[PDB]
Amino acid sequence: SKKHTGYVGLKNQGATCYMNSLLQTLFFTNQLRKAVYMMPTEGDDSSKSVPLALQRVFYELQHSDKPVGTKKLTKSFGWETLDSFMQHDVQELCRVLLDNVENKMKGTCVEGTIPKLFRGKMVSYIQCKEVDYRSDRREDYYDIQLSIKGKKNIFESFVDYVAVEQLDGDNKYDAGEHGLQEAEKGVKFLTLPPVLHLQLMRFMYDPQTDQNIKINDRFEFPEQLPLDEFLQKTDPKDPANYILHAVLVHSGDNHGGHYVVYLNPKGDGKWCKFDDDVVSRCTKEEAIEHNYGGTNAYMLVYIRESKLSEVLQAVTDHDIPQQLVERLQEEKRIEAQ
Numbered sequence: 185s186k187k188h189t190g191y192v193g194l195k196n197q198g199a200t201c202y203m204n205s206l207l208q209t210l211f212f213t214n215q216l217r218k219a220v221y222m223m224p225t226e227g228d229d230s231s232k233s234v235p236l237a238l239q240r241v242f243y244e245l246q247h248s249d250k251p252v253g254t255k256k257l258t259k260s261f262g263w264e265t266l267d268s269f270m271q272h273d274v275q276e277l278c279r280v281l282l283d284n285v286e287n288k289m290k291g292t293c294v295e296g297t298i299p300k301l302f303r304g305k306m307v308s309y310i311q312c313k314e315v316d317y318r319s320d321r322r323e324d325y326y327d328i329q330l331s332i333k334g335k336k337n338i339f340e341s342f343v344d345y346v347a348v349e350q351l352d353g354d355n356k357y358d359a360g361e362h363g364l365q366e367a368e369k370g371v372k373f374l375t376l377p378p379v380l381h382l383q384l385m386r387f388m389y390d391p392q393t394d395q396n397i398k399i400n401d402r403f404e405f406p407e408q409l410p411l412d413e414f415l416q417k418t419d420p421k422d423p424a425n426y427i428l429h430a431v432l433v434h435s436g437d438n439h440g441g442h443y444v445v446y447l448n449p450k451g452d453g454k455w456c457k458f459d460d461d462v463v464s465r466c467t468k469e470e471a472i473e474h475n476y477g478g479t480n481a482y483m484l485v486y487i488r489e490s491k492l493s494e495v496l497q498a499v500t501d502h503d504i505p506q507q508l509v510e511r512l513q514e515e516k517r518i519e520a521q
């Protein structure tokens with residue numbers, strides 16, 4: 185309900201699984217929201233336009249007192265059934281949403297907003313021990329998948345993410361003309377984005393048991409996350425200290441269950457629980473400490489301390505172009521009549 189917390193829910197759809205959790209998360213990434221409103225969607229069709237459909241949901245979440253529907257948005261990228269959401273991860277849905285937007289924002293004042301907010305950089309190397317050969321590949325990433333099995337916390341997950349793997353014995357590195365060689369494999373972070381999307385791997389295929397198992401283990405994530413020690417080169421002027429913004433939680437059975445997101449929208453430590461149509465205030469401990477598990481958190485969103493004021497900049501009704509408002513209201517008039 186809007187009068188309590190000032191924020192509005194999304195309509196209850198069991199088929200959509202984790203979409204409402206993602207939509208709310210992306211909606212309260214305010215710099216993206218402003219950016220999404222400026223997309224030149226005039227020419228796009230009312231039914232099959234994902235950028236327009238995201239504009240509608242965002243517009244409605246900003247203005248509506250009643251809960252917001254997502255039926256038009258689901259129809260725009262063709263994930264109508266339950267099976268569609270079941271055979272995709274949350275990061276993949278986010279890729280589908282942000283690609284459409286990123287492509288629409290090309291050739292505009294808002295170009296490069298997605299990579300500005302989300303794109304970091306890393307290096308993957310393979311270094312041979314006893315022979316002079318190295319293989320560096322630079323990669324962009326818009327999200328990080330973290331390992332949690334036998335890991336107490338995020339710090340240990342980042343330790344494991346950058347940990348050097350030893351390619352030796354039966355798993356020796358095929359080094360081309362040099363042949364089978366003992367080698368070291370590893371990953372190093374060059375940059376970390378303003379908005380950091382961390383997915384926690386709670387579904388590892390087990391080799392010994394020979395079955396996909398869910399992981400219900402306790403996993404601790406902090407309100408503040410320093411990441412300088414995991415960068416190759418630290419900047420004194422801009423340290424990589426991050427603030428917890430969102431916690432996407434799942435409960436109950438796999439293949440149905442119940443999805444909730446917890447959010448810290450203004451970055452000010454004042455938490456709200458977004459349970460589909462019901463938005464309500466909650467404690468830090470309900471959002472953070474009580475979702476450690478051992479009910480499990482699967483995605484976490486951190487925002488960089490230095491970029492917080494820009495990323496969560498105040499949106500108003502004036503930051504939506506009139507042409508878009510006129511269009512969306514003209515739809516709302518016809519639907520009601």
Ligand SMILES: Nc1cc(-c2cc(Cl)cc3c2O[C@@H](C(=O)N2CCNCC2)C3)ccn1
Binds near residue numbers: 269271272383438441
């Ligand atoms: N990264 C990620 C994880 C989940 C997720 C997390 C937990 Cl702890 C339990 C469930 C989840 O989704 C159900 C499931 O098993 N799915 C089969 C694989 N794809 C997703 C749907 C149940 C959902 C979305 N994105």
